[PDB]
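Predicting holo structure, ZMA bound.
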Amino acid sequence: DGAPPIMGSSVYITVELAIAVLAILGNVLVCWAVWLNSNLQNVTNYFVVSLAAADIAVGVLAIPFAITISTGFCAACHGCLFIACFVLVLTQSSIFSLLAIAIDRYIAIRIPLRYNGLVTGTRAKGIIAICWVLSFAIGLTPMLGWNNCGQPKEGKNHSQGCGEGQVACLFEDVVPMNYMVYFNFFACVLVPLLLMLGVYLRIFLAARRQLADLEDNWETLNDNLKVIEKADNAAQVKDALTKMRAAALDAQKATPEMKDFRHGFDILVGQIDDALKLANEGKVKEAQAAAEQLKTTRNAYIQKYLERARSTLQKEVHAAKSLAIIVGLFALCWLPLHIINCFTFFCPDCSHAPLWLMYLAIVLSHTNSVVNPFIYAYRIREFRQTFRKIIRSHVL
Ligand SMILES: CC(C)CCC[C@@H](C)[C@H]1CC[C@H]2[C@@H]3CC=C4C[C@@H](O)CC[C@]4(C)[C@H]3CC[C@]12C
Ligand SMILES: CC(C)CCC[C@@H](C)[C@H]1CC[C@H]2[C@@H]3CC=C4C[C@@H](O)CC[C@]4(C)[C@H]3CC[C@]12C
Ligand SMILES: CC(C)CCC[C@@H](C)[C@H]1CC[C@H]2[C@@H]3CC=C4C[C@@H](O)CC[C@]4(C)[C@H]3CC[C@]12C
Ligand SMILES: Nc1nc(NCCc2ccc(O)cc2)nc2nc(-c3ccco3)nn12
Ligand SMILES: CCCCCCCC/C=C\CCCCCCCC(=O)O
Ligand code: NA
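Done. C-alpha coordinates:
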Protein backbone atom coordinates (compact mmCIF):
# COMPACT_ATOMS: atom_id res chain seq x y z
CA ASP A 1 0.00 0.00 0.00
CA GLY A 2 1.15 3.53 0.86
CA ALA A 3 -0.28 6.94 -0.05
CA PRO A 4 -0.20 7.43 -3.86
CA PRO A 5 3.09 9.18 -4.62
CA ILE A 6 1.47 11.75 -6.91
CA MET A 7 -0.26 13.45 -3.93
CA GLY A 8 2.99 14.43 -2.25
CA SER A 9 4.58 15.17 -5.64
CA SER A 10 1.73 17.59 -6.44
CA VAL A 11 2.48 19.57 -3.27
CA TYR A 12 6.22 19.66 -3.97
CA ILE A 13 5.79 20.79 -7.61
CA THR A 14 3.20 23.49 -6.79
CA VAL A 15 5.57 24.97 -4.17
CA GLU A 16 8.58 24.85 -6.55
CA LEU A 17 6.57 26.66 -9.25
CA ALA A 18 5.46 29.34 -6.75
CA ILE A 19 9.10 29.90 -5.75
CA ALA A 20 10.20 30.05 -9.40
CA VAL A 21 7.67 32.82 -10.24
CA LEU A 22 8.75 34.97 -7.29
CA ALA A 23 12.48 34.45 -7.92
CA ILE A 24 12.08 35.59 -11.52
CA LEU A 25 9.84 38.59 -10.71
CA GLY A 26 11.86 40.03 -7.83
CA ASN A 27 15.26 39.61 -9.49
CA VAL A 28 14.09 41.06 -12.84
CA LEU A 29 13.10 44.07 -10.73
CA VAL A 30 16.66 44.31 -9.31
CA CYS A 31 18.16 44.25 -12.82
CA TRP A 32 15.62 46.79 -14.10
CA ALA A 33 16.43 49.19 -11.24
CA VAL A 34 20.19 49.10 -11.93
CA TRP A 35 19.58 49.64 -15.64
CA LEU A 36 17.30 52.63 -15.00
CA ASN A 37 19.13 54.55 -12.27
CA SER A 38 22.69 55.86 -12.72
CA ASN A 39 23.02 56.22 -8.94
CA LEU A 40 22.91 52.41 -8.82
CA GLN A 41 25.47 51.85 -11.60
CA ASN A 42 28.65 51.25 -9.59
CA VAL A 43 31.01 48.29 -9.28
CA THR A 44 29.40 46.90 -6.14
CA ASN A 45 26.06 46.59 -7.93
CA TYR A 46 27.58 44.84 -10.95
CA PHE A 47 28.09 41.91 -8.57
CA VAL A 48 24.53 42.42 -7.28
CA VAL A 49 23.27 42.09 -10.88
CA SER A 50 25.39 38.96 -11.46
CA LEU A 51 23.87 37.49 -8.29
CA ALA A 52 20.33 38.40 -9.49
CA ALA A 53 21.07 36.72 -12.86
CA ALA A 54 22.03 33.54 -11.03
CA ASP A 55 18.74 33.69 -9.07
CA ILE A 56 16.70 34.32 -12.24
CA ALA A 57 18.35 31.18 -13.66
CA VAL A 58 17.24 29.22 -10.56
CA GLY A 59 13.64 30.04 -11.49
CA VAL A 60 13.98 29.48 -15.25
CA LEU A 61 16.24 26.40 -15.28
CA ALA A 62 17.24 24.88 -11.92
CA ILE A 63 13.67 24.51 -10.62
CA PRO A 64 12.36 22.81 -13.82
CA PHE A 65 15.43 20.55 -13.59
CA ALA A 66 14.69 19.80 -9.91
CA ILE A 67 11.08 18.89 -10.75
CA THR A 68 12.31 16.62 -13.56
CA ILE A 69 14.89 14.76 -11.47
CA SER A 70 12.33 14.13 -8.67
CA THR A 71 10.59 11.68 -11.02
CA GLY A 72 13.59 9.36 -11.39
CA PHE A 73 13.05 9.17 -15.18
CA CYS A 74 15.33 7.05 -17.39
CA ALA A 75 18.17 9.05 -18.93
CA ALA A 76 21.64 8.74 -20.33
CA CYS A 77 23.83 9.06 -17.29
CA HIS A 78 25.74 12.15 -18.45
CA GLY A 79 22.46 13.86 -19.38
CA CYS A 80 21.22 12.98 -15.90
CA LEU A 81 24.41 14.45 -14.35
CA PHE A 82 23.93 17.72 -16.18
CA ILE A 83 20.34 18.06 -14.84
CA ALA A 84 21.53 17.14 -11.34
CA CYS A 85 24.57 19.44 -11.16
CA PHE A 86 23.55 22.61 -13.03
CA VAL A 87 22.19 24.16 -9.80
CA LEU A 88 25.69 23.76 -8.30
CA VAL A 89 27.03 26.07 -11.01
CA LEU A 90 24.46 28.74 -10.05
CA THR A 91 25.18 28.32 -6.36
CA GLN A 92 28.96 28.57 -6.92
CA SER A 93 28.45 31.73 -9.00
CA SER A 94 26.45 33.17 -6.07
CA ILE A 95 29.29 32.43 -3.64
CA PHE A 96 31.83 34.19 -5.90
CA SER A 97 29.57 37.26 -6.26
CA LEU A 98 29.05 37.40 -2.48
CA LEU A 99 32.81 37.16 -1.89
CA ALA A 100 33.57 39.89 -4.44
CA ILE A 101 31.06 42.23 -2.77
CA ALA A 102 32.72 41.71 0.62
CA ILE A 103 36.19 42.42 -0.80
CA ASP A 104 34.90 45.48 -2.67
CA ARG A 105 33.53 47.02 0.55
CA TYR A 106 36.76 46.16 2.38
CA ILE A 107 38.91 47.98 -0.18
CA ALA A 108 36.49 50.94 -0.02
CA ILE A 109 36.82 51.36 3.75
CA ARG A 110 40.55 50.56 3.97
CA ILE A 111 42.00 52.62 1.11
CA PRO A 112 39.16 54.94 -0.02
CA LEU A 113 41.57 57.25 -1.88
CA ARG A 114 42.83 54.37 -4.03
CA TYR A 115 39.44 52.71 -4.55
CA ASN A 116 38.36 54.33 -7.81
CA GLY A 117 41.72 53.75 -9.51
CA LEU A 118 41.91 50.13 -8.38
CA VAL A 119 38.33 48.85 -8.74
CA THR A 120 37.09 49.86 -12.19
CA GLY A 121 34.06 48.78 -14.18
CA THR A 122 36.12 47.02 -16.83
CA ARG A 123 38.11 45.09 -14.23
CA ALA A 124 34.88 44.11 -12.46
CA LYS A 125 33.39 42.85 -15.74
CA GLY A 126 36.46 40.67 -16.32
CA ILE A 127 36.27 39.26 -12.78
CA ILE A 128 32.57 38.43 -13.24
CA ALA A 129 33.29 36.55 -16.52
CA ILE A 130 36.10 34.57 -14.89
CA CYS A 131 33.90 33.71 -11.91
CA TRP A 132 31.16 32.37 -14.19
CA VAL A 133 33.68 30.19 -16.09
CA LEU A 134 35.10 28.82 -12.82
CA SER A 135 31.54 28.16 -11.55
CA PHE A 136 30.80 25.93 -14.56
CA ALA A 137 34.06 24.02 -14.06
CA ILE A 138 33.45 23.50 -10.36
CA GLY A 139 29.74 22.64 -10.47
CA LEU A 140 30.11 20.30 -13.46
CA THR A 141 33.22 18.45 -12.22
CA PRO A 142 31.18 15.18 -11.88
CA MET A 143 30.74 15.19 -15.68
CA LEU A 144 34.54 14.83 -15.99
CA GLY A 145 34.45 11.38 -14.40
CA TRP A 146 33.86 11.89 -10.66
CA ASN A 147 30.45 10.24 -10.76
CA ASN A 148 28.63 6.97 -10.11
CA CYS A 149 27.71 6.29 -13.76
CA GLY A 150 30.06 3.32 -13.71
CA GLN A 151 28.17 1.64 -10.84
CA PRO A 152 24.48 1.76 -11.78
CA LYS A 153 21.62 0.60 -9.57
CA GLU A 154 20.53 -2.35 -11.68
CA GLY A 155 17.48 -3.04 -9.52
CA LYS A 156 16.14 0.47 -9.99
CA ASN A 157 17.23 0.40 -13.64
CA HIS A 158 15.21 -2.72 -14.39
CA SER A 159 12.23 -1.85 -12.20
CA GLN A 160 11.85 1.45 -14.08
CA GLY A 161 12.45 -0.25 -17.43
CA CYS A 162 15.34 1.91 -18.52
CA GLY A 163 17.05 1.08 -21.79
CA GLU A 164 20.67 0.33 -22.55
CA GLY A 165 23.10 2.91 -21.20
CA GLN A 166 20.35 4.62 -19.17
CA VAL A 167 19.98 5.03 -15.42
CA ALA A 168 17.06 5.99 -13.25
CA CYS A 169 18.00 9.64 -12.78
CA LEU A 170 18.14 10.16 -9.02
CA PHE A 171 20.55 12.65 -7.45
CA GLU A 172 22.12 10.37 -4.84
CA ASP A 173 22.50 7.48 -7.27
CA VAL A 174 24.67 9.44 -9.75
CA VAL A 175 26.44 12.25 -7.81
CA PRO A 176 29.05 10.84 -5.37
CA MET A 177 28.64 11.91 -1.77
CA ASN A 178 32.42 12.35 -1.26
CA TYR A 179 32.30 14.98 -4.00
CA MET A 180 29.31 16.66 -2.31
CA VAL A 181 30.83 16.70 1.18
CA TYR A 182 34.61 17.13 0.72
CA PHE A 183 34.74 19.06 -2.59
CA ASN A 184 31.49 21.04 -2.87
CA PHE A 185 30.64 21.63 0.81
CA PHE A 186 33.98 21.87 2.64
CA ALA A 187 36.25 23.35 -0.04
CA CYS A 188 33.84 25.28 -2.28
CA VAL A 189 31.14 26.56 0.13
CA LEU A 190 32.27 26.49 3.72
CA VAL A 191 35.81 27.88 3.14
CA PRO A 192 34.48 30.90 1.16
CA LEU A 193 31.77 31.54 3.74
CA LEU A 194 34.38 31.57 6.51
CA LEU A 195 36.54 33.93 4.42
CA MET A 196 33.53 36.23 3.97
CA LEU A 197 32.93 36.24 7.73
CA GLY A 198 36.52 37.31 8.32
CA VAL A 199 36.38 40.09 5.72
CA TYR A 200 33.16 41.54 7.21
CA LEU A 201 34.77 41.35 10.67
CA ARG A 202 37.73 43.34 9.32
CA ILE A 203 35.33 45.91 7.81
CA PHE A 204 33.62 46.55 11.15
CA LEU A 205 36.98 46.67 12.97
CA ALA A 206 38.35 49.20 10.48
CA ALA A 207 35.27 51.43 10.80
CA ARG A 208 35.45 51.25 14.59
CA ARG A 209 39.15 52.20 14.62
CA GLN A 210 38.63 55.18 12.29
CA LEU A 211 35.72 56.51 14.36
CA ALA A 212 37.91 56.13 17.46
CA ASP A 213 40.76 58.05 15.84
CA LEU A 214 38.32 60.76 14.78
CA GLU A 215 37.12 61.13 18.38
CA ASP A 216 40.66 61.07 19.76
CA ASN A 217 41.76 63.93 17.50
CA TRP A 218 38.67 65.92 18.46
CA GLU A 219 39.15 65.52 22.21
CA THR A 220 42.89 66.23 21.90
CA LEU A 221 42.09 69.59 20.29
CA ASN A 222 39.56 70.58 22.96
CA ASP A 223 41.48 69.37 26.02
CA ASN A 224 44.63 71.22 24.98
CA LEU A 225 42.57 74.38 24.54
CA LYS A 226 41.63 73.97 28.20
CA VAL A 227 45.29 73.48 29.17
CA ILE A 228 46.28 76.72 27.41
CA GLU A 229 43.55 78.73 29.14
CA LYS A 230 44.54 77.27 32.53
CA ALA A 231 48.26 77.69 31.93
CA ASP A 232 50.67 79.88 33.86
CA ASN A 233 53.86 79.63 31.76
CA ALA A 234 54.86 79.90 28.10
CA ALA A 235 56.37 76.40 27.96
CA GLN A 236 53.10 74.75 29.03
CA VAL A 237 51.28 76.78 26.37
CA LYS A 238 54.05 75.78 23.96
CA ASP A 239 53.65 72.10 24.82
CA ALA A 240 49.88 72.10 24.39
CA LEU A 241 49.99 73.91 21.04
CA THR A 242 52.43 71.27 19.81
CA LYS A 243 49.95 68.51 20.69
CA MET A 244 47.15 70.42 18.94
CA ARG A 245 49.27 70.82 15.81
CA ALA A 246 49.73 67.05 15.49
CA ALA A 247 46.06 66.23 16.06
CA ALA A 248 45.16 68.85 13.47
CA LEU A 249 47.53 67.43 10.86
CA ASP A 250 46.21 63.95 11.66
CA ALA A 251 42.59 65.05 11.20
CA GLN A 252 43.36 66.87 7.94
CA LYS A 253 45.14 63.72 6.74
CA ALA A 254 42.12 61.57 7.68
CA THR A 255 39.17 63.67 6.42
CA PRO A 256 34.87 71.40 -4.85
CA GLU A 257 33.96 70.60 -1.23
CA MET A 258 37.56 69.58 -0.49
CA LYS A 259 38.84 73.11 -1.21
CA ASP A 260 36.57 74.53 1.50
CA PHE A 261 37.96 71.74 3.69
CA ARG A 262 41.59 72.79 3.23
CA HIS A 263 40.66 76.41 4.00
CA GLY A 264 39.24 75.42 7.38
CA PHE A 265 42.34 73.49 8.39
CA ASP A 266 44.54 76.20 6.86
CA ILE A 267 43.02 78.78 9.22
CA LEU A 268 43.42 76.28 12.05
CA VAL A 269 47.07 75.36 11.50
CA GLY A 270 48.09 78.93 10.69
CA GLN A 271 46.47 80.05 13.93
CA ILE A 272 48.33 77.38 15.90
CA ASP A 273 51.60 78.56 14.32
CA ASP A 274 50.84 82.21 15.10
CA ALA A 275 50.26 81.23 18.74
CA LEU A 276 53.42 79.10 18.82
CA LYS A 277 55.64 81.86 17.42
CA LEU A 278 54.34 84.07 20.24
CA ALA A 279 55.06 81.22 22.68
CA ASN A 280 58.73 80.80 21.71
CA GLU A 281 59.14 84.52 22.46
CA GLY A 282 57.59 84.19 25.92
CA LYS A 283 54.49 86.29 25.22
CA VAL A 284 52.22 83.87 27.05
CA LYS A 285 49.31 86.30 27.46
CA GLU A 286 49.26 87.10 23.74
CA ALA A 287 49.68 83.37 23.02
CA GLN A 288 46.65 82.55 25.18
CA ALA A 289 44.73 85.37 23.48
CA ALA A 290 45.68 84.10 20.02
CA ALA A 291 44.72 80.57 21.08
CA GLU A 292 41.18 81.79 21.78
CA GLN A 293 40.77 82.43 18.05
CA LEU A 294 40.99 78.67 17.48
CA LYS A 295 37.57 78.23 19.11
CA THR A 296 35.77 80.11 16.34
CA THR A 297 37.60 78.06 13.69
CA ARG A 298 36.74 74.81 15.47
CA ASN A 299 33.06 75.82 15.47
CA ALA A 300 33.03 77.23 11.93
CA TYR A 301 34.88 74.42 10.10
CA ILE A 302 36.43 71.60 12.10
CA GLN A 303 33.28 70.39 13.84
CA LYS A 304 31.45 70.46 10.50
CA TYR A 305 34.02 68.19 8.87
CA LEU A 306 34.13 65.86 11.88
CA GLU A 307 30.37 65.36 11.56
CA ARG A 308 30.52 64.58 7.83
CA ALA A 309 33.37 62.11 8.36
CA ARG A 310 31.37 60.39 11.11
CA SER A 311 28.18 60.16 9.02
CA THR A 312 30.05 58.76 6.03
CA LEU A 313 31.54 56.02 8.21
CA GLN A 314 28.18 55.18 9.80
CA LYS A 315 26.64 54.90 6.32
CA GLU A 316 29.37 52.45 5.29
CA VAL A 317 28.74 50.42 8.45
CA HIS A 318 25.00 50.35 7.77
CA ALA A 319 25.57 49.35 4.14
CA ALA A 320 28.04 46.61 5.15
CA LYS A 321 25.51 45.24 7.66
CA SER A 322 22.87 45.08 4.91
CA LEU A 323 25.16 43.10 2.61
CA ALA A 324 26.22 40.76 5.42
CA ILE A 325 22.54 39.89 6.07
CA ILE A 326 22.48 38.59 2.47
CA VAL A 327 25.43 36.30 3.25
CA GLY A 328 23.74 35.10 6.45
CA LEU A 329 20.48 34.21 4.67
CA PHE A 330 22.46 32.33 1.97
CA ALA A 331 24.03 30.24 4.77
CA LEU A 332 20.67 29.67 6.51
CA CYS A 333 19.02 28.49 3.28
CA TRP A 334 21.86 26.17 2.05
CA LEU A 335 23.37 24.70 5.23
CA PRO A 336 20.51 22.25 6.03
CA LEU A 337 21.02 20.35 2.76
CA HIS A 338 24.80 20.28 3.27
CA ILE A 339 24.39 19.05 6.86
CA ILE A 340 21.99 16.28 5.75
CA ASN A 341 24.64 15.14 3.22
CA CYS A 342 27.19 14.99 6.06
CA PHE A 343 24.89 12.63 8.01
CA THR A 344 24.27 10.48 4.94
CA PHE A 345 28.02 10.31 4.21
CA PHE A 346 29.61 10.10 7.67
CA CYS A 347 26.98 8.00 9.53
CA PRO A 348 26.29 4.74 7.64
CA ASP A 349 24.62 3.46 10.85
CA CYS A 350 22.03 6.28 10.69
CA SER A 351 18.76 5.89 8.85
CA HIS A 352 18.71 8.17 5.83
CA ALA A 353 16.91 11.48 6.33
CA PRO A 354 13.29 10.88 5.29
CA LEU A 355 12.10 11.94 1.86
CA TRP A 356 9.78 14.70 3.14
CA LEU A 357 12.75 16.27 4.89
CA MET A 358 15.00 16.01 1.80
CA TYR A 359 12.41 17.89 -0.29
CA LEU A 360 11.84 20.48 2.43
CA ALA A 361 15.59 21.18 2.46
CA ILE A 362 15.59 21.42 -1.35
CA VAL A 363 12.66 23.91 -1.30
CA LEU A 364 14.44 25.95 1.39
CA SER A 365 17.62 26.25 -0.70
CA HIS A 366 15.49 27.45 -3.64
CA THR A 367 13.71 30.07 -1.51
CA ASN A 368 17.10 31.80 -1.20
CA SER A 369 16.56 33.01 -4.77
CA VAL A 370 13.48 35.01 -3.64
CA VAL A 371 14.79 36.88 -0.62
CA ASN A 372 17.54 39.31 -1.81
CA PRO A 373 15.14 41.77 -3.58
CA PHE A 374 13.30 42.15 -0.22
CA ILE A 375 16.55 42.91 1.64
CA TYR A 376 17.47 45.56 -0.93
CA ALA A 377 13.96 47.07 -0.65
CA TYR A 378 13.95 47.22 3.14
CA ARG A 379 17.56 48.21 3.78
CA ILE A 380 18.83 50.34 0.85
CA ARG A 381 16.98 53.58 0.12
CA GLU A 382 18.12 54.00 -3.49
CA PHE A 383 16.80 50.51 -4.40
CA ARG A 384 13.54 51.10 -2.52
CA GLN A 385 12.92 54.42 -4.23
CA THR A 386 13.71 53.01 -7.67
CA PHE A 387 11.46 49.99 -7.09
CA ARG A 388 8.65 52.37 -6.13
CA LYS A 389 9.17 54.42 -9.30
CA ILE A 390 9.16 51.36 -11.56
CA ILE A 391 6.02 49.78 -10.08
CA ARG A 392 4.00 53.01 -10.06
CA SER A 393 4.91 53.76 -13.69
CA HIS A 394 5.10 50.39 -15.49
CA VAL A 395 2.62 48.32 -13.48
CA LEU A 396 0.01 50.83 -12.29
C1 LIG B 1 18.37 27.90 -23.52
C2 LIG B 1 17.97 26.80 -22.55
C3 LIG B 1 16.47 26.87 -22.27
C4 LIG B 1 18.38 25.43 -23.09
C5 LIG B 1 18.00 24.29 -22.15
C6 LIG B 1 18.80 23.05 -22.51
C7 LIG B 1 18.27 21.81 -21.78
C8 LIG B 1 16.75 21.87 -21.73
C9 LIG B 1 18.80 20.55 -22.46
C10 LIG B 1 20.31 20.66 -22.68
C11 LIG B 1 20.91 19.26 -22.49
C12 LIG B 1 19.67 18.36 -22.39
C13 LIG B 1 19.82 16.97 -21.77
C14 LIG B 1 20.93 16.22 -22.51
C15 LIG B 1 20.73 14.72 -22.58
C16 LIG B 1 19.70 14.08 -21.98
C17 LIG B 1 19.76 12.58 -21.82
C18 LIG B 1 18.45 11.92 -22.28
O1 LIG B 1 18.51 10.50 -22.01
C19 LIG B 1 17.27 12.59 -21.58
C20 LIG B 1 17.23 14.09 -21.91
C21 LIG B 1 18.50 14.83 -21.45
C22 LIG B 1 18.57 14.82 -19.93
C23 LIG B 1 18.48 16.27 -21.93
C24 LIG B 1 17.40 17.10 -21.25
C25 LIG B 1 17.28 18.50 -21.86
C26 LIG B 1 18.61 19.22 -21.72
C27 LIG B 1 18.95 19.44 -20.26
C1 LIG C 1 21.64 26.06 9.84
C2 LIG C 1 20.62 25.35 10.72
C3 LIG C 1 19.23 25.96 10.53
C4 LIG C 1 20.68 23.85 10.42
C5 LIG C 1 19.42 23.07 10.80
C6 LIG C 1 19.82 21.73 11.38
C7 LIG C 1 19.18 20.53 10.68
C8 LIG C 1 19.62 20.57 9.23
C9 LIG C 1 19.59 19.26 11.43
C10 LIG C 1 19.18 19.35 12.91
C11 LIG C 1 18.78 17.93 13.37
C12 LIG C 1 19.24 17.04 12.22
C13 LIG C 1 18.62 15.64 12.10
C14 LIG C 1 18.65 14.87 13.43
C15 LIG C 1 18.90 13.39 13.26
C16 LIG C 1 18.80 12.74 12.07
C17 LIG C 1 18.59 11.23 12.06
C18 LIG C 1 19.54 10.56 11.07
O1 LIG C 1 19.22 9.17 10.96
C19 LIG C 1 19.47 11.26 9.70
C20 LIG C 1 19.81 12.76 9.80
C21 LIG C 1 18.87 13.49 10.76
C22 LIG C 1 17.45 13.51 10.18
C23 LIG C 1 19.37 14.92 10.97
C24 LIG C 1 19.30 15.74 9.68
C25 LIG C 1 19.79 17.19 9.85
C26 LIG C 1 19.05 17.90 10.98
C27 LIG C 1 17.56 18.04 10.68
C1 LIG D 1 30.33 26.62 10.58
C2 LIG D 1 29.55 25.36 10.93
C3 LIG D 1 28.09 25.49 10.53
C4 LIG D 1 30.21 24.13 10.31
C5 LIG D 1 29.20 23.04 9.98
C6 LIG D 1 29.16 21.97 11.06
C7 LIG D 1 29.01 20.57 10.49
C8 LIG D 1 30.17 20.32 9.54
C9 LIG D 1 28.90 19.56 11.65
C10 LIG D 1 27.77 19.98 12.59
C11 LIG D 1 27.10 18.71 13.15
C12 LIG D 1 28.04 17.62 12.66
C13 LIG D 1 27.50 16.19 12.65
C14 LIG D 1 27.01 15.77 14.04
C15 LIG D 1 27.02 14.26 14.24
C16 LIG D 1 27.43 13.38 13.32
C17 LIG D 1 27.12 11.90 13.49
C18 LIG D 1 28.44 11.13 13.40
O1 LIG D 1 28.25 9.71 13.48
C19 LIG D 1 29.11 11.47 12.08
C20 LIG D 1 29.44 12.95 11.98
C21 LIG D 1 28.20 13.81 12.09
C22 LIG D 1 27.30 13.55 10.88
C23 LIG D 1 28.62 15.27 12.19
C24 LIG D 1 29.24 15.76 10.87
C25 LIG D 1 29.75 17.20 10.92
C26 LIG D 1 28.59 18.10 11.32
C27 LIG D 1 27.52 18.03 10.22
N1 LIG E 1 21.29 14.69 -1.27
C1 LIG E 1 20.61 15.39 -2.22
N2 LIG E 1 19.55 14.80 -2.82
C2 LIG E 1 18.83 15.47 -3.77
N3 LIG E 1 17.76 14.86 -4.32
C3 LIG E 1 17.40 13.53 -3.90
C4 LIG E 1 16.52 13.49 -2.66
C5 LIG E 1 16.40 12.00 -2.42
C6 LIG E 1 17.27 11.34 -1.54
C7 LIG E 1 17.15 9.97 -1.38
C8 LIG E 1 16.17 9.26 -2.11
O1 LIG E 1 16.05 7.90 -1.96
C9 LIG E 1 15.31 9.91 -3.00
C10 LIG E 1 15.44 11.29 -3.15
N4 LIG E 1 19.16 16.71 -4.15
C11 LIG E 1 20.24 17.27 -3.55
N5 LIG E 1 20.78 18.50 -3.76
C12 LIG E 1 21.83 18.51 -2.87
C13 LIG E 1 22.74 19.66 -2.66
C14 LIG E 1 22.83 20.78 -3.46
C15 LIG E 1 23.80 21.55 -2.79
C16 LIG E 1 24.23 20.88 -1.64
O2 LIG E 1 23.53 19.69 -1.57
N6 LIG E 1 22.00 17.40 -2.11
N7 LIG E 1 20.95 16.62 -2.62
C1 LIG F 1 29.50 37.83 -18.70
C2 LIG F 1 29.18 36.42 -18.22
C3 LIG F 1 29.43 35.40 -19.33
C4 LIG F 1 29.38 33.98 -18.78
C5 LIG F 1 30.10 33.01 -19.71
C6 LIG F 1 29.87 31.56 -19.29
C7 LIG F 1 30.45 30.59 -20.31
C8 LIG F 1 30.87 29.29 -19.64
C9 LIG F 1 30.50 28.13 -20.54
C10 LIG F 1 31.27 27.04 -20.57
C11 LIG F 1 32.33 26.84 -19.52
C12 LIG F 1 33.06 25.52 -19.78
C13 LIG F 1 33.48 24.87 -18.47
C14 LIG F 1 33.68 23.37 -18.65
C15 LIG F 1 32.57 22.58 -17.98
C16 LIG F 1 32.60 21.11 -18.41
C17 LIG F 1 32.13 20.96 -19.85
C18 LIG F 1 31.16 19.80 -19.94
O1 LIG F 1 31.51 18.66 -19.56
O2 LIG F 1 30.01 19.97 -20.39
NA1 NA G 1 21.76 32.47 -5.56
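The chain has two domains: 2-211+308-395, 212-307.
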